């Protein structure tokens, strides 16, 4: 007579338990190697040999209980066998795992991915990009931030009238203007998590897409990159239905219903990005599916001035005006990425980038 | 000499027994983790650790009978082994499961889905949308409600003359007018259940479609979304037979016979939705397969007035007339979804949406 807690692979606290188990690797006869390397120079690579507990029956001595944990071997099922019937030690283990895991993810952003029909983490947590480091047009980031915050802070008003509690944003513009960078900065600012979804995958279907959109982690953003490339439309729409034009078992109607239909879930934010606004079917970007659409474009006077004052702090304000005037006189349109590269050429050299502005 | 009740996966009361078993999880040596999370803020996520009984041979103490329940492990078969030959405990268990399950589904709508050749539930029951929250044209929802109620309440008249006891409705219009929302509201009002069916699935055939249409749950609605996209027609029909145009092993004649043929079942309601009424073959929408067809269109004066008086309750009636007049003068055609979004911009701000009506 014992208690055999069974936690299979498909669990939210799976990573938390794995992290705690790696933390409590002491007193474990079976091990797995945990070496990592940091090269410095001269062929002297630092070693960091450690011990991940192997998928075995290691006996743990938590609170003097001789707890036995077994991880099997692609299907995985972790087991926490104990003595008697207490259930308190399980709660303590879960709480300690939560305390340890959330401590690790502090000041970072966790990136998930779509594996099969489920979300799994993708690498170590990434360092968040400061929001002010991304410079957009005057009064554009503030509007999006305010709209998202208002949507988050008013759930009652949605329920009191019956509208589904959902939202969606679309960003479009020329290549190299700040779409992905702004999305990353916003995710870092809002302390959310990014879920990456590809519509051209070879293992995605309508039912799997609906399940993925239904089981998305809480306090997270869903990102759809280049929705146009997954469905040719417009000129085709005048003659025949919208073909899928790719590899994967997906249909236009399935995606349309999944984004906003009858079985769509609640409390979800979806971001979409494209480079050809005119290649998107009108039914896809109608209100209800895309509440706010914004255009990010080429540089302007204020944007160039802010970029200059950001890359060379401490300089006099006249230099920024000189740089902006010269850039806008020498060329008409320019992308922020090109300006960033040109600045990267002249590292820590103010008044040097104000002279060699020949980039026609 | 015992009694071994066997209930495989393909049963209607399967969910009821699973819910009862989760209710009676006490005195079970083997367990499975039942933790859920509700984020609040500051990285403080509430834990709800519980215990779903694992697929094991847990010994239950219902009525002091030492009942043994075993769930195997994709094929599933639940077993209720008991002592002697009584069969009374089985009646009591089924009745308690029914009492518990129907208690949970109160005021909600259950959404089913097509898995293989059987209907299975899809997530938690969803909150029902009030019917008055969806505003359609004058005297349109009432007609459909009355027709459906008349069909439900008169089975004798159908039998006494020999007509098959079936019905079907079709809704068509511009994208973003209220088709799906009205269907959801009607399903909530009628205390029915929604079954989602996709005609472009990669595992659908004529025999499977017939089986699914024959085994649909009682007191339920069958929904076919975007029937046009599954069969190109019209201009093709003038030259060659109807092609399927997609992925899946289905034919036009198979669908036509399944909807209304010789083997079609009785007491079934089917809803169909499309955006291009002119792309549907005449044989598909003939009487007998689609009894009532209705058109949902753009906004009108009364619809706009009702929407305004719904989103801002307590306002004077003149404001609604002013808003309707200004909207209809500034623009001719406008979808209700755009009106909903424009109202969503001005939250709790009457007399503000009556001034900034520039949405051309
Ligand atoms: N507004 C901006 N301010 C600062 N850096 C920017 C800005 N826009 C782009 N960059 C820089 O350009 C590089 C890539 O930008 P990013 O990937 O966000 O562009 P994009 O417009 O989303 O491109 P693509 O459409 O090809 O995905 C990064 O080094 C990023 O810092
Ligand atoms: N008549 C209406 N009254 C109130 N809200 C409406 C109405 N029509 C649409 N909406 C709102 O529009 C949004 C989506 O509407 P819905 O999905 O029902 O439109 P649809 O015409 O069925 O669209 P699609 O053809 O793309 O499926 C929801 O927020 C819903 O509340
Ligand atoms: Mg990018
Ligand atoms: Mg709809």
mmCIF file of C-alpha atoms in Angstrom, chain A residues 1-8 11-13 16 87 90-91 94-95 98 102 147 150-151 154 157-159 161-164 167 205-207 210-211 214 218-219 237-238 240-243 248-251 253 256-257 261-266 281 283 286-288 291, chain B residues 25-33 35 37 39 43-47 49-51 54 111 122 126-127 129-130 133 175-176 180 183-184 194 196 198 200-202 223 225-226 228-229 232 245 247 275-276 279 310-313 337-338 340-341 343-348:
data_model
loop_
_atom_site.group_PDB
_atom_site.id
_atom_site.type_symbol
_atom_site.label_atom_id
_atom_site.label_comp_id
_atom_site.label_asym_id
_atom_site.label_seq_id
_atom_site.Cartn_x
_atom_site.Cartn_y
_atom_site.Cartn_z
ATOM 1 C CA UNK A 1 0.000 0.000 0.000
ATOM 2 C CA UNK A 2 1.743 3.139 -1.276
ATOM 3 C CA UNK A 3 1.057 6.202 -3.431
ATOM 4 C CA UNK A 4 2.235 6.194 -7.055
ATOM 5 C CA UNK A 5 1.915 9.656 -8.571
ATOM 6 C CA UNK A 6 2.151 9.444 -12.365
ATOM 7 C CA UNK A 7 3.121 12.503 -14.401
ATOM 8 C CA UNK A 8 3.377 11.767 -18.143
ATOM 9 C CA UNK A 11 2.151 18.184 -18.337
ATOM 10 C CA UNK A 12 2.720 21.887 -17.704
ATOM 11 C CA UNK A 13 4.886 21.279 -14.626
ATOM 12 C CA UNK A 16 9.478 22.315 -13.368
ATOM 13 C CA UNK A 87 0.070 13.690 -0.533
ATOM 14 C CA UNK A 90 3.890 15.985 -3.519
ATOM 15 C CA UNK A 91 2.543 19.492 -2.911
ATOM 16 C CA UNK A 94 5.504 21.014 -6.764
ATOM 17 C CA UNK A 95 5.831 24.267 -4.811
ATOM 18 C CA UNK A 98 7.600 26.346 -9.058
ATOM 19 C CA UNK A 102 10.148 30.960 -11.885
ATOM 20 C CA UNK A 147 -4.618 49.036 -26.590
ATOM 21 C CA UNK A 150 -6.777 48.072 -22.059
ATOM 22 C CA UNK A 151 -7.761 44.705 -23.534
ATOM 23 C CA UNK A 154 -11.083 44.907 -19.015
ATOM 24 C CA UNK A 157 -16.847 44.577 -20.075
ATOM 25 C CA UNK A 158 -16.462 41.818 -22.671
ATOM 26 C CA UNK A 159 -18.507 39.278 -20.699
ATOM 27 C CA UNK A 161 -22.209 42.175 -23.378
ATOM 28 C CA UNK A 162 -21.339 38.748 -24.830
ATOM 29 C CA UNK A 163 -18.502 39.577 -27.238
ATOM 30 C CA UNK A 164 -15.884 36.784 -27.296
ATOM 31 C CA UNK A 167 -8.007 40.128 -29.970
ATOM 32 C CA UNK A 205 -4.052 20.063 -39.964
ATOM 33 C CA UNK A 206 -7.260 21.870 -39.052
ATOM 34 C CA UNK A 207 -7.951 19.734 -35.977
ATOM 35 C CA UNK A 210 -7.594 24.095 -33.350
ATOM 36 C CA UNK A 211 -6.116 21.980 -30.552
ATOM 37 C CA UNK A 214 -7.005 25.886 -27.604
ATOM 38 C CA UNK A 218 -1.590 31.214 -20.344
ATOM 39 C CA UNK A 219 0.043 34.664 -20.280
ATOM 40 C CA UNK A 237 -10.067 34.389 -55.754
ATOM 41 C CA UNK A 238 -11.720 35.994 -58.797
ATOM 42 C CA UNK A 240 -11.408 29.652 -58.209
ATOM 43 C CA UNK A 241 -11.384 29.047 -54.442
ATOM 44 C CA UNK A 242 -8.279 29.793 -52.401
ATOM 45 C CA UNK A 243 -5.698 27.061 -52.953
ATOM 46 C CA UNK A 248 0.692 20.356 -45.246
ATOM 47 C CA UNK A 249 -2.922 19.272 -44.825
ATOM 48 C CA UNK A 250 -4.485 22.683 -44.240
ATOM 49 C CA UNK A 251 -7.330 24.611 -45.859
ATOM 50 C CA UNK A 253 -11.687 27.695 -44.413
ATOM 51 C CA UNK A 256 -10.557 31.083 -40.979
ATOM 52 C CA UNK A 257 -12.751 29.078 -38.602
ATOM 53 C CA UNK A 261 -15.396 30.584 -35.327
ATOM 54 C CA UNK A 262 -17.665 28.603 -33.017
ATOM 55 C CA UNK A 263 -15.042 26.519 -31.188
ATOM 56 C CA UNK A 264 -12.527 29.353 -30.740
ATOM 57 C CA UNK A 265 -11.271 29.734 -27.171
ATOM 58 C CA UNK A 266 -11.120 32.852 -24.986
ATOM 59 C CA UNK A 281 -7.960 37.803 -48.605
ATOM 60 C CA UNK A 283 -12.223 37.784 -45.164
ATOM 61 C CA UNK A 286 -11.928 41.576 -41.303
ATOM 62 C CA UNK A 287 -12.683 43.015 -37.848
ATOM 63 C CA UNK A 288 -13.111 40.305 -35.247
ATOM 64 C CA UNK A 291 -8.817 44.276 -34.534
ATOM 65 C CA UNK B 25 -10.734 9.367 -6.646
ATOM 66 C CA UNK B 26 -10.353 8.802 -2.890
ATOM 67 C CA UNK B 27 -8.931 5.512 -1.575
ATOM 68 C CA UNK B 28 -6.908 4.974 -4.764
ATOM 69 C CA UNK B 29 -3.277 3.923 -4.354
ATOM 70 C CA UNK B 30 -2.375 4.760 -7.967
ATOM 71 C CA UNK B 31 -2.923 8.346 -9.107
ATOM 72 C CA UNK B 32 -2.285 10.824 -11.901
ATOM 73 C CA UNK B 33 -1.457 14.492 -11.391
ATOM 74 C CA UNK B 35 -2.616 20.376 -11.349
ATOM 75 C CA UNK B 37 -2.695 27.105 -12.985
ATOM 76 C CA UNK B 39 -1.734 33.417 -13.231
ATOM 77 C CA UNK B 43 4.983 35.676 -11.123
ATOM 78 C CA UNK B 44 2.536 34.278 -8.548
ATOM 79 C CA UNK B 45 0.748 31.416 -10.306
ATOM 80 C CA UNK B 46 -1.843 29.608 -8.204
ATOM 81 C CA UNK B 47 -1.450 25.837 -7.937
ATOM 82 C CA UNK B 49 -2.735 20.020 -7.448
ATOM 83 C CA UNK B 50 -5.307 17.218 -7.398
ATOM 84 C CA UNK B 51 -5.528 13.537 -8.351
ATOM 85 C CA UNK B 54 -4.529 6.671 -13.203
ATOM 86 C CA UNK B 111 -19.282 21.147 -28.525
ATOM 87 C CA UNK B 122 -13.964 19.124 -27.537
ATOM 88 C CA UNK B 126 -18.563 26.794 -23.315
ATOM 89 C CA UNK B 127 -20.639 29.635 -21.917
ATOM 90 C CA UNK B 129 -24.221 33.614 -25.751
ATOM 91 C CA UNK B 130 -27.515 35.405 -24.995
ATOM 92 C CA UNK B 133 -26.895 40.031 -27.766
ATOM 93 C CA UNK B 175 -18.265 38.067 -44.365
ATOM 94 C CA UNK B 176 -18.869 39.454 -40.891
ATOM 95 C CA UNK B 180 -21.727 31.891 -36.623
ATOM 96 C CA UNK B 183 -25.902 29.802 -34.790
ATOM 97 C CA UNK B 184 -24.209 29.768 -31.379
ATOM 98 C CA UNK B 194 -23.212 21.669 -31.618
ATOM 99 C CA UNK B 196 -18.577 20.405 -35.860
ATOM 100 C CA UNK B 198 -15.425 19.613 -41.837
ATOM 101 C CA UNK B 200 -12.265 18.989 -46.330
ATOM 102 C CA UNK B 201 -10.797 16.555 -43.796
ATOM 103 C CA UNK B 202 -8.137 14.069 -44.890
ATOM 104 C CA UNK B 223 -22.912 22.274 -38.547
ATOM 105 C CA UNK B 225 -18.960 25.307 -42.413
ATOM 106 C CA UNK B 226 -18.139 26.709 -45.870
ATOM 107 C CA UNK B 228 -18.758 25.930 -51.181
ATOM 108 C CA UNK B 229 -15.001 25.598 -50.629
ATOM 109 C CA UNK B 232 -15.986 23.785 -57.164
ATOM 110 C CA UNK B 245 -10.873 20.102 -55.289
ATOM 111 C CA UNK B 247 -7.614 16.586 -49.928
ATOM 112 C CA UNK B 275 -20.270 33.281 -48.486
ATOM 113 C CA UNK B 276 -20.921 32.668 -52.219
ATOM 114 C CA UNK B 279 -21.085 28.859 -56.260
ATOM 115 C CA UNK B 310 -27.236 47.581 -26.612
ATOM 116 C CA UNK B 311 -23.617 48.712 -26.250
ATOM 117 C CA UNK B 312 -24.489 51.851 -24.225
ATOM 118 C CA UNK B 313 -27.517 51.056 -22.050
ATOM 119 C CA UNK B 337 -18.430 43.683 -37.007
ATOM 120 C CA UNK B 338 -16.977 47.060 -37.999
ATOM 121 C CA UNK B 340 -18.671 46.484 -32.932
ATOM 122 C CA UNK B 341 -14.993 47.342 -33.347
ATOM 123 C CA UNK B 343 -17.725 50.851 -30.371
ATOM 124 C CA UNK B 344 -14.909 48.838 -28.779
ATOM 125 C CA UNK B 345 -12.572 51.760 -29.465
ATOM 126 C CA UNK B 346 -14.777 54.067 -27.360
ATOM 127 C CA UNK B 347 -15.301 52.063 -24.187
ATOM 128 C CA UNK B 348 -17.898 53.547 -21.812
#
